[PDB]
Swiss-Prot record:
GO molecular function: ATP binding; ATP hydrolysis activity; ATP-dependent protein folding chaperone; CTP binding; dATP binding; disordered domain specific binding; DNA polymerase binding; enzyme-substrate adaptor activity
Gene: HSP90AA1
Outcome (variant: residue 32 to A): Strong ATP-binding. Strong interaction with HSF1, HIF1A, ERBB2, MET, KEAP1 and RHOBTB2. No effect on interaction with TSC1
Post-translational modification: ISGylated. S-nitrosylated; negatively regulates the ATPase activity and the activation of eNOS by HSP90AA1.
Domain comment (free text): The TPR repeat-binding motif mediates interaction with TPR repeat-containing proteins like the co-chaperone STUB1.
Protein name: Heat shock protein HSP 90-alpha
Purpose: Molecular chaperone that promotes the maturation, structural maintenance and proper regulation of specific target proteins involved for instance in cell cycle control and signal transduction. Undergoes a functional cycle that is linked to its ATPase activity which is essential for its chaperone activity. This cycle probably induces conformational changes in the client proteins, thereby causing their activation. Interacts dynamically with various co-chaperones that modulate its substrate recognition, ATPase cycle and chaperone function.
Organism for this UniProt entry: Homo sapiens
GO biological process, one term: regulation of protein-containing complex assembly
Family: Belongs to the heat shock protein 90 family.
Full-protein interval shown: 16 to 224 of 732
Gene Ontology cellular component annotations, sorted alphabetically: apical plasma membrane; axonal growth cone; basolateral plasma membrane; brush border membrane; cell surface; cytoplasm; cytosol; dendritic growth cone
Residue positions where N6-acetyllysine is found in the record: 43, 69
Amino acid sequence: EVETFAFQAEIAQLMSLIINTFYSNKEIFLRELISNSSDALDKIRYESLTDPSKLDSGKELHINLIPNKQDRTLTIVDTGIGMTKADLINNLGTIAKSGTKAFMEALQAGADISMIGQFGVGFYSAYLVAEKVTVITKHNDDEQYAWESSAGGSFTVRTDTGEPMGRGTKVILHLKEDQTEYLEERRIKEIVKKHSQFIGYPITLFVEK
Ligand SMILES: Cc1ccc(F)cc1C(N)=O
């Protein structure tokens, strides 16, 4: 059972701008997704300070980067607070409408796309490198869900019957054919060292056979 939703017009406009604007510095998508994972990990950590049972779904707080050249996917996994179904539908827990408005004004006022994270909509930078994004998520207060979009104005939400996650979020980037450099170990290592060297959670880059 799959539900299909329209993006709000402003979010569709943001995604088309990200997809259609010529901009070579695409690597910042990974910084933005790792920063989102760090924010989600901070949230479950804070909740656990006064209620340790919040970590019954998993005590480890970490970020995994999983490249798969056979599937042409880069997956960013975190054990953060996750997202409810309502969060997913509401632009993946962001204030994306007002964030997009602030971002697009900054662009005609001298800012550039690499600054997207300052406006709370860094998730959508995934579409710099991905033709399709799948988000698997599990929040303590809801069931496991799969969000997915290939842009084009719509996204889907369904209950996820896949591998149980415990708690957190998995962002699966189905990479564009010409963006496979982001599956190479040395390229991922370089980006993490350049942009994410001070993230306060272990970032583990998985290797492939
Ligand atoms: C350069 C760029 C790419 C994508 C985007 F969404 C915005 C911009 C910008 N800085 O105007």
